[PDB]
Amino acid sequence: SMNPPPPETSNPNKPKRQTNQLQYLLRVVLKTLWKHQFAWPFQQPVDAVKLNLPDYYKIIKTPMDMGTIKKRLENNYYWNAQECIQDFNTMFTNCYIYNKPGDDIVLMAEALEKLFLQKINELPTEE
Ligand SMILES: C[C@@H]1C(=O)N(C)CCN1CCOc1ccc(C2CCN(c3ccc4nnc(Cl)n4n3)CC2)cc1
Asked: Which residues bear the site annotation Acetylated histone binding?
């Protein structure tokens, strides 16, 4: 089977704005998670062809990864911080859905998620 197209990261028809929350989501949240020791399987869309995961896209219908989230923040694709937070949550839950409790990839996702939740609990109030 083929991989689906990646999630859209840019759209010239969507309106754009700059907020302190979206700035914090790129500057603090994504930059911190990106450097984490267990971030590398989550830095690009799951390549089910190269990774030999033929049922991945039969089970995961809403794929999401940090490479996509970063490109969306860098392209001013998100209007609300909540859209970015939901993408981080979709990424984690996809991993828990496809994999099983105790799998190393799940342990890796759980560690990035705990860090994510710490940095999101310190999200600055909207200026
Ligand atoms: C479906 C799934 C997914 O959810 N995502 C998002 C992308 C990935 N993908 C497929 C699964 O990928 C994985 C990517 C990385 C790993 C880790 C597991 C832990 N570790 C080890 C462990 C023991 C060991 N002994 N000697 C070496 Cl060396 N090691 N290294 C490094 C590689 C596991 C699965």
From this structure: 99
Say if residues 77 and 26 touch (Cβ distance below 8 Å).
Answer: no
Cβ atoms within 10 A of the Cβ of 37, count? 8
Determine which helix (DSSP H) or strand (DSSP E) holds 71, and give its type and residue range.
Answer: helix 66-74
- Ligand 1 neighbourhood includes 64 CB (under 6 angstroms): no
- Looking at the structure of the chain, the number of domains it has is 1
Burial class (CB in 10 A: 0-12, 13-18, 19+), 2: exposed
For the chain, percent helix, then strand, then coil, each to nearest 5? 55, 0, 45
Q: Which of 96, 104, 108 maximizes ligand 1 atoms within 8 Å of its Cβ, making it the mutation to test the pocket?
A: 104
Helix axes 81-98, 104-121, angle to 10 degrees: 160
Resolution (angstroms) stands at 2.0
Task: Print the domain residue range for 33.
Answer: 19-123
CA distances 122 to 42, 50, 92, Å, are 22, 37, 20
Q: Which method was used?
A: X-ray
Q: Does residue 109 form part of some domain?
A: yes
